[PDB]
Amino acid sequence: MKFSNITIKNFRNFEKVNINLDNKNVIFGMNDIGKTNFLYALRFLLDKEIRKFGFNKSDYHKHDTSKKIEIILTLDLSNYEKDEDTKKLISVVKGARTSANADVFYIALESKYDDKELYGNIILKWGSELDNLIDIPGRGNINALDNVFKVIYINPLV
């Protein structure tokens, strides 16, 4: 029904940032580097064609690959009765929810670098409780989260 918050840690020039959200969001400022990295973090979390690749050594904050990248998004499911997107989410999620937490949901991203193979693997989790998340199931190249969200990217150039 509603986007609420996003947290980003140890990703590019973000070290620990917490941003409140809504359905419509406008980002502006003079940095022009964090503004693009914000949308890249969103694409990594929700876009399968970007997440299809991994994380490089330059994707870690300060290029220190001994730290973990966390990106966590929060939703509000309060209008299940009046909304049909809440049903679209709830029909793919079954069991990861509890009744005491029937109005909040979490989608998380985690990455730890492999020094031997020089690769950063991305693993996704959801859950209602932030201290108990489980892997999103999937077969092959497809994910259960890919069945819900369609991310359309618009750019005048490229």
């Binding site: 299940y80 809440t86 049903k87 709830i90 029909s91 079954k94 509890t98 009744s99 029937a102 069945n147």
Partner: protein, 221 residues
């Protein structure tokens, strides 16, 4: 004939069809018509009594990324209601692991077996069902279970309703009334030879002779 009046009807339907009528053909035609017509995220569930019919319908329908359930009514509860939401209704101690010898004659012993023994229970008396009463118990104690069931399916196809216990009737009617999910029932009144497994023919006949929100058709082909 009336086979064209069914595909054009959307809602609660009965089909009182005898042996040799072609129940599978009309069931598959209705399933395909419903899937083609609808453009939403919802799915369908087809529940049978044997794995042979389930596999036949699976083969006839084909392949899709839309999540439809085709299988036996015993697998329906295990896959959708019990295994995902058992711990949300009773507690975290109740296990969702099971691979079903250990039958008893009480309901409490069924929970005891499922918990301590970690295997799905059963009943010695074939006139009572443990699966379909536990499923209804879970549905009435978990809000997320009802939410998932409502958000997931928009129609459920049931065949051979004459060979149904009272618990199956209770669960299906709970889904039809409290959750507002459509039903499609097909059955032969004079094929209750499975009464040795606790079948109750009274349910189908009562539905035929008393239901007011059900559309009734008969096939003589």
């Amino acid at each position: 004939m009336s086979r064209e009046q069914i595909i054009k009807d959307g809602g609660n339907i009965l089909v009182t069809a005898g042996a040799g009528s072609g129940k599978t053909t009309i069931l598959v035609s209705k399933i395909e018509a419903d899937l083609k017509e609808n453009k939403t995220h919802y799915s369908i569930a087809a529940v049978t009594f044997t794995n042979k019919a389930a596999k036949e319908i699976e083969g006839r329908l084909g392949y899709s990324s839309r999540g439809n359930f085709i299988g036996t009514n015993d697998g329906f509860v295990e896959s959708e209601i019990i295994r995902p939401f058992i711990k949300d209704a009773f507690g975290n101690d109740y296990p969702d692991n099971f691979t079903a010898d250990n039958q008893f004659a009480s309901y409490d012993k069924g929970l005891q077996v499922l918990k301590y023994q970690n295997i799905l229970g059963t009943y010695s008396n074939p006139k009572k069902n443990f699966k379909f009463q536990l499923a209804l118990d879970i549905l009435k104690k978990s809000l997320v279970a009802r939410q998932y069931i409502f958000s997931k399916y928009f129609k459920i196809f049931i065949d051979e309703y004459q060979d149904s216990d009272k618990d199956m009737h209770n669960l299906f009617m709970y889904l039809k009334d409290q959750l507002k999910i459509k039903l499609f029932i097909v059955g032969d009144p004079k094929q209750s030879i499975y009464i040795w497994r606790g079948a109750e023919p009274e349910n189908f006949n009562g539905l035929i002779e008393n239901s007011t929100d059900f559309n009734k058709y008969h096939l003589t082909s």
